[PDB]
């Protein structure tokens, strides 16, 4: 208790704008006009582009 403890707080502002930092996952080609499952910067959905 008396001895110190190092603390780091990582605050991520998930702004609905271009994302400067993103994970290591590799993207894939883009498909259109067909019902597909899509991910964009973390926004996940299912539909037709």
């Amino acid at each position: 208790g008396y001895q110190p403890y190092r603390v780091v707080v990582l605050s991520f502002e998930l702004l609905h704008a271009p994302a400067t930092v993103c994970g290591p996952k590799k993207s894939t080609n883009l498909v259109k006009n067909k019902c597909v499952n899509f991910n964009f910067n973390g926004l996940t959905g299912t539909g037709v582009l």
Binding site: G42, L43, T44, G45
Partner: protein, 49 residues
Amino acid sequence: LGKLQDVVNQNAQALNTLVKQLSSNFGAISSVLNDILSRLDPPEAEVQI
């Protein structure tokens, strides 16, 4: 033709209201199910959902 017209509005308005009810938190962190699911594991996502 007010009477008939009135009927239509009474219905249409109701539907609109219902649809808008999908954008309310009701206390959850977000009103979008996909965001809650993609940010939280099921053990903590159950409470929000």
